[PDB]
């Protein structure tokens, strides 16, 4: 009822999700266990106006 990350592509060394998104593994474990948010997208035009 809600998606899930595979543990093989997160916790193994080196973290393949971590390389694919260029996130540190500390950041990755902080995201995918709901410890910290992540800004998935942003605007530019409304941002500057």
């Amino acid at each position: 009822a809600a998606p899930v990350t595979h543990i093989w592509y997160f916790k193994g060394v080196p973290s393949r999700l971590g390389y694919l998104l260029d996130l540190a593994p500390k950041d990755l474990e902080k995201i995918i266990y709901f410890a910290a948010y992540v800004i998935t997208s942003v605007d530019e035009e409304m941002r500057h106006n």
Partner: protein, 49 residues
Amino acid sequence: QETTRVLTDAAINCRSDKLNGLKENVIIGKLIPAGTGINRYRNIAVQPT
């Protein structure tokens, strides 16, 4: 060795096994390609002169 780590990056690269080694044919139950399993010997026809 490292049955986890060897497996996952093979799965990332979609790396296709070719079944031409020696430990492969032992696993899948085919004849090994060494000794009496190569095609120089395995296709011998025998006829009685």
